[PDB]
Point group: C2
Chain length 153, copies 2
Amino acid sequence: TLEDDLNETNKYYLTNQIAVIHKKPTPVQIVNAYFKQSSTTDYNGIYKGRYIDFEAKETKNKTSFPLQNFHDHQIEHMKQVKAQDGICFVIISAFDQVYFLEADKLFYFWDRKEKNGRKSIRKDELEETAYPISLGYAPRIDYISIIEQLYFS
Amino acid sequence: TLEDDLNETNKYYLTNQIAVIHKKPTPVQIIKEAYFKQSSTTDYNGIYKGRYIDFEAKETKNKTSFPLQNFHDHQIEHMKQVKAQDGICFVIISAFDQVYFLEADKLFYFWDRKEKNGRKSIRKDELEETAYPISLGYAPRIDYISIIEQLYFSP
C-alpha cells in the first residue's frame, strides 16, 4: 500500500529534517457526518523554501492506469499550483514500479481523455513520461531525490 | 467569523490567481461515529509566488491579553520546522477589535518566555508593538498577503 509507504516516507523526511510534508486529513461533515471529496490534492509541504504538492494513486492493473483514479477538482488545483510556480506532480504505483509524473504530463493525459475514449495511461506511456522513483528501506519511496534532481540541479 | 473571513479571503486569492491557500480539514477519528483529534500541524498552508505559506489563526474576545492556550506545542514545533525549511510562517490574531499579523519569529519569543521563564499571554501593548495590523476590506476581507508582500518579497 502506497499510502502506508508514503506515510513512513514522509515521517522519515520529517524526523531527519529533510522536508516537512503531510497528508491532508479526509474532509468530513456535520452532524452525526458524511464524506466530502476535497477540491485539493492530498499531499503538500515544504522542501528548501519551495511549496511541494502531490497526489498519490496505485493500481493493480497490469496494462494501464485508469485516470478516473483522479477527479477534476484535483486537476484544477494542480494547474492553480503550477500557475504559482509550485513543485507539483503525482506519484503512481503501477506495473511493479513507482513513478513521479510531472503535473504537465498528467494534464496532457487528462485533457485528451474524452476526445476520444483514451481513459487510461498505458504502461509504455507512463515509462515514457514519468521518472522511476528509487525504492528503499528508509525512506521507502525516495521522491525528494527526484525533486532535488529536477528542480535543484 | 475569523475562519469565515479567511475562507472568503482565500477564495478571493484563488479566483484572482494571487495565491493558492486552503484551510486543512480538521482531523476526525471515525461505532462508526466521530471523535475530534487535534493535528500535529497548523490549519492553513499553500503557495504564493513559488513560496510555501503556513499559518494559524486565533480569535480571542479578551480585552487585556491574548492567552497562549490558543496554540498547542505540536503546532509551535511545526512552525519552527517550516521556518527552518525557509518557509513563510506566521499567525493571524483577531483581538482588541483588530486583526494582527504576527511573524512566527515573534511568536516563538512569547512561547519561549514560558519555556525559560514562566507566564504567559500577549498583552495589548506587547502585541500592538510586535504585530502588523491587517487591512480589513471587502475583497479580500483580511489582506494578509499584502503584509507577506512587504515583509518577505519587496519592502
